Design an enzyme around this catalytic site. Structure first.
Site, PDB file in Angstrom:
ATOM      1  CG  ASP A 184      12.098  29.079 -28.894  1.00 12.10           C
ATOM      2  OD1 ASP A 184      12.407  29.402 -30.065  1.00 12.10           O
ATOM      3  OD2 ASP A 184      12.913  28.548 -28.100  1.00 12.10           O
ATOM      4  CB  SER A 203       5.111  27.285 -25.146  1.00 16.80           C
ATOM      5  OG  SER A 203       6.376  26.686 -25.356  1.00 16.80           O
ATOM      6  NE  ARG A 204       6.807  31.450 -32.815  1.00 21.38           N
ATOM      7  CZ  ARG A 204       7.155  32.413 -33.670  1.00 21.38           C
ATOM      8  NH1 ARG A 204       7.160  33.687 -33.291  1.00 21.38           N
ATOM      9  NH2 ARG A 204       7.488  32.102 -34.918  1.00 21.38           N
ATOM     10  CB  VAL A 205       8.215  24.457 -28.284  1.00 25.94           C
ATOM     11  CG1 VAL A 205       8.315  22.962 -28.018  1.00 25.94           C
ATOM     12  CG2 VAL A 205       9.535  25.004 -28.805  1.00 25.94           C
ATOM     13  N   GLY A 206       5.200  24.369 -27.789  1.00 20.20           N
ATOM     14  CA  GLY A 206       3.889  23.863 -27.381  1.00 20.20           C
ATOM     15  C   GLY A 206       3.876  22.450 -26.835  1.00 20.20           C
TER      16      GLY A 206
END
Lengths: 36, 124, 116, 58, 265, 254, 116, 126
Positions: F94, F119-122
């Site tokens: 991710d 972090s693509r979740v972020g």
């Protein structure tokens, strides 16, 4: 990346840019060491 | 009609100005005689009608042109409010010490400083 | 630091920072030359160059290649000598003094020998 | 003064003055540019034949 | 032509592109600043020499050639050096004072014996009256600048904000200032030294005007060269990116072929 | 690690590393005489790792709300993130934290390249208090990395460019961190608050190290009650923003 | 030298040296420009670019491709012509005059034509 | 004998290769450098050698001595070729015992070292 242009890696991997970096630089140190 | 220029700044490019010549400290009116003479380090004043502004210069050359134009060129030129008394003193003293400081124009250069810094304090 | 002591660690780390920063400058020197280097930049260059040389050492077994007799430098010497150079105590000593020698003492001895 | 006996030229005299006047300013008004007007790293070297004698300053 | 060779070459030129681009933007800033100082020195040239317009002045020679110590500014030094040699054909016995190691460079090859004085360390910072005056001083002192029939200053003039032309302007000595046709039209004290002082003062101002112009011409030429070097580097990066990928593909195939051949047997 | 996830608990798994796991899978298949592919790995070498990493998951309320979090490790060869196996794993995960020897030697430790790490979740799973000061810590740094090459020409700098460099150099030195010394959230926020808003700009760079130690112990002795509200609430009050400024400015006096 | 004579041999070596120097500088040239070479190096590049062109030749079987009559240059004349070019005797001649001709007489000829 | 006369020769062509980069740098300084700058270029011409023409040690040792100690620094580059074959004619004609010494002993005593030095400085003036 840092030193990728300037720093001397092996002979037979030389830029002209590596060659001049060491040339302009060696001269500089010579002048300063001469004065001191 | 005045051109008052320094190497780094051009202040003017007006009615009357007063300038410290090598000859008598002279005032300049609207239709002055074409004159060209030195400027000693002194005080250049300029009155634009009623209000006047005061610039202490380093010295240069004054030029009066045929067509009622005045060209004053100086290396440094500053208002009086722009000076600190003590810096002048610290220099003055060091200059006086440096007169007869040793062989060379080091000795002679100091003599030049003393006179200029004296001409400065005399105004305030 | 827990193993060699906070002094040792700090010396090593700043030798390494000096040598890294050096690389980045060698780039600017390649293109732009000396005129765009700060006074600290030029000092960094000078010191790193001495550091690099100071890392050389004549080996006993390399005697036939060097001509120079081999040196053995105690660890404490090494840390002390490099700390001194990192602080600035030898900025007046030319490069050649640091090259192919032992401890900091052998540097000064070589420096005086080349004066004559 | 008597810069005549000494080696001083007219403009060299004015500079000596101009320096003192710059140093005389209120320190806060001695701006970056003003202090630059005061320093130079310039050298001069005389040449004969294409060799030359000793480098000097100023 | 191995993958690692292309990688090294590629990262090296990628820095070059970055450095040269930066220098160019720096030079742009340096030029804004040096533009205003060029205007100021051009007003102390309209007002300073307006005496010489009216007085209408007219003339072994002294040539002073003005560049700097710095490279990376195109043909600033060679172009001005050609202009000087061209004048040196018309008079080959003249003395030369070079201001800047780079011009000294050029004239030391072609006319080595003519050079009698070289000035160093001028180019880095913006030129100042102090520098001009002190140079003038040493000109008057050791070069005997007073005892010359003709005096010329060679410098580069920034015609536009993109390009430059090697210009020339002459300086007349105290002996020549007096013999000017309309000289006497102004009230002048012959008792005190006005001719000598005006010659020595103009020598310093004109040099300051030359250097202020030659400096703004050198920044502009360096911003031009740095724009080019950066653009060329970009193309180099593109050619080597393409080369990298061909080599990348080949290495994967070649490595796999070895594996296949070993598996088949 | 799944036993925790399945029974409403939370686990963290570190695979150290997946490079060497790939090599071991390769050893098996070649020796079982399975057909080799690129770099001699088996055909299904992507599926070696995707099969594994997809097992890390945040479960729904219905299924107990458990979680398994994975920190796979990949050793790159020459900095070549475009290399085969790294490229597989980069596309599975991710996001990535990327570390550079260059940064390490420069003194930046942990040697994290902020530009290449994501972090693509972020934000979704960041502490609100950190999210409030970090939001523009992203900005000031992205701006710093853009302009970083101009530090070589200090003499030539304009106003907002010099300003960006000063803040950047400081925020970078702020992110330096000794090993085995993880900081609590409430200890992190004020340090970042002090940097982001400007309270560091006046302090010389070499002093940021000793600033961090002294500014923290001061807060635990004088304003511990603020740290406590940060820890317990996780958000930041308009009052707390104001009290924090007050606490910060006060320390700046020394 | 034992086969072609010392003169021939030496002309070849110098031509080869000149071309080599020029190749070696292709980096700088492409990035920084011609302005950044020494003056000794500018000359070599000028001379090499003329040698490059002078090595080209119109073939008789190519007359259709070129529209240019084929040239067959004698070995002796090739040596002399290149010797002369190395010695500097044609530095005032522009580049294009060396391109796609025979011996040095054709260079002079083409140069005069280009002057017209 | 060869180890003696060629003391630094290899790192001396690392001292010369260093200053080879200084020339296209464009700078005209280090007159002390000029000394080594010129020497190396002459040493390089000395090491050139035709094919099928190997030299005995007694022929080599003088040549290397001549080059290393700067006895060549004042000779034209284009004449180093002819310098070699003449110098060895001169040593065979006159100092024939000098060569025989190096040949048989394989060394140079302090006595020979100066005898050769004297024979060198001698030949420089044609």
């Amino acid at each position: 990346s840092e030193g990728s242009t300037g720093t001397p890696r092996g002979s037979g991997s030389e830029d002209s840019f590596v060659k001049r970096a060491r040339a302009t630089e060696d001269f500089f140190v010579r002048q300063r060491e001469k004065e001191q | 009609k005045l051109q008052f220029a320094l190497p780094h700044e051009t202040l003017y490019s007006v009615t009357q100005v007063n300038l410290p010549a090598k000859s008598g400290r002279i005032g300049v009116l609207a239709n002055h005689v074409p004159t060209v003479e030195q400027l000693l380090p002194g005080v250049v004043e300029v009155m634009e009608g009623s209000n006047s502004k005061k610039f202490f210069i380093s010295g240069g050359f004054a030029t009066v042109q045929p067509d009622s134009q005045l060209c004053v060129t100086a290396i440094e030129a500053f208002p009086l409010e722009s000076f600190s008394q003590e810096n002048i003193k610290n220099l003055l003293a060091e200059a006086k010490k440096n007169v007869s400081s040793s062989d060379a124009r080091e000795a002679a250069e100091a003599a030049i400083q003393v006179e200029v810094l004296e001409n400065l304090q005399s105004v305030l | 630091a827990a193993v060699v002591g906070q002094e040792h660690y700090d010396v090593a780390s700043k030798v390494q920072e000096t040598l890294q920063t050096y690389k980045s400058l060698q780039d600017i020197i390649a293109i732009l030359g000396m005129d765009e280097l700060s006074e600290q930049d030029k000092l960094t260059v000078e010191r790193a160059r001495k550091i690099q040389r100071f890392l050389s050492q004549p080996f006993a077994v390399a005697e036939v290649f060097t001509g120079i007799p081999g040196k053995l430098v105690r660890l404490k010497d090494t840390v002390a000598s490099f700390k001194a150079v990192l602080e600035g105590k030898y900025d007046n000593i030319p490069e050649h003094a640091f090259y192919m020698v032992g401890g900091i003492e052998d540097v000064v001895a070589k420096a005086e020998k080349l004066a004559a | 003064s008597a810069w005549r006996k000494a080696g001083i030229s007219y403009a060299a005299y004015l500079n000596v003055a101009a320096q003192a006047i710059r140093s005389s300013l209120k320190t806060e008004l001695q701006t970056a540019s003003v202090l630059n007007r005061s320093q130079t790293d310039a050298f001069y070297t005389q040449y004969k034949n294409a060799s030359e004698p000793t480098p000097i300053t100023k | 032509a191995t993958l690692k060779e292309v990688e090294m070459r590629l990262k090296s030129i990628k820095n070059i592109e970055k450095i040269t681009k930066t220098m160019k933007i720096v030079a742009s800033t340096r030029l804004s600043k040096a533009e205003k100082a060029k205007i100021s020195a051009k007003k102390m040239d309209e007002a300073e020499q307006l005496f010489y317009k009216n007085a209408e002045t007219k003339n072994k020679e002294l040539i002073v050639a003005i560049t700097s110590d710095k490279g990376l500014c195109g043909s600033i030094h060679s172009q001005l050096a050609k202009a000087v040699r061209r004048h040196l054909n018309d008079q080959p016995n003249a003395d030369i004072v070079t201001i800047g190691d780079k011009i000294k460079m050029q004239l030391l090859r072609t006319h080595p014996n003519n050079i009698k004085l070289s000035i160093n360390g001028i180019g880095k910072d913006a030129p100042t009256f102090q520098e001009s005056a002190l140079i003038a001083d040493k000109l008057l002192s050791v070069m005997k600048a007073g005892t010359y029939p003709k005096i010329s200053i060679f410098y580069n003039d920034p015609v536009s904000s993109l390009s430059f032309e090697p210009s020339e302007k002459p300086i007349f000595n105290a002996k020549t200032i007096e013999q000017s046709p309309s000289f006497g039209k102004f009230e002048i004290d012959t008792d005190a030294n006005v001719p000598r002082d005006l010659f020595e003062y103009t020598l310093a101002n004109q040099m300051l005007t030359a250097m202020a112009q030659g400096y703004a011409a050198e920044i502009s030429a360096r911003r031009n060269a740095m724009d080019n070097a950066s653009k060329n580097a970009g193309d180099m990066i593109n050619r080597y990116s393409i080369l990298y990928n061909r080599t990348r593909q080949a290495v994967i195939t070649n490595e796999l072929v070895d594996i296949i051949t070993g598996a088949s047997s | 690690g799944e036993w925790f996830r399945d029974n409403g608990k939370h686990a963290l798994i570190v695979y150290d590393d997946l490079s060497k796991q790939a090599v071991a899978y390769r050893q098996l298949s070649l020796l079982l005489r399975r057909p080799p592919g690129r770099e001699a790995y088996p055909g299904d070498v992507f599926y070696l790792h995707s099969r594994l990493l997809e097992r890390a998951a945040k479960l729904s309320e219905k299924e107990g709300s458990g979680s398994l979090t994975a920190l796979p490790v990949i050793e790159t060869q020459g900095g070549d993130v475009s290399a085969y196996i790294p490229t597989n794993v980069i596309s599975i995960t991710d996001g990535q934290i990327f570390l550079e020897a260059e940064l390490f030697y420069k003194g930046i430790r942990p040697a994290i390249n902020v530009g290449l790490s994501v972090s693509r979740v972020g934000s979704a799973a960041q502490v609100k208090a950190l999210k409030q000061v970090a939001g523009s810590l992203k900005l000031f740094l992205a701006q710093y990395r853009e302009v970083a090459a101009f530090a070589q020409f200090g003499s030539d700098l304009d106003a907002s460019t010099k300003q960006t460099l000063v803040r950047g150099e400081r925020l970078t030195q702020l992110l330096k961190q000794n090993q085995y010394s993880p900081l609590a959230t409430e200890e992190q926020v004020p340090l970042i608050y002090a940097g982001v808003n400007g309270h560091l700009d006046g302090i010389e760079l070499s002093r940021i190290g000793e600033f961090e130690s002294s500014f923290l112990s001061y807060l635990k002795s004088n304003h511990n009650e603020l740290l406590t509200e940060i820890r317990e609430k996780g958000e930041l009050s308009k009052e707390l923003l104001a009290s924090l400024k007050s606490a910060t400015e006060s320390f700046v006096a020394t």
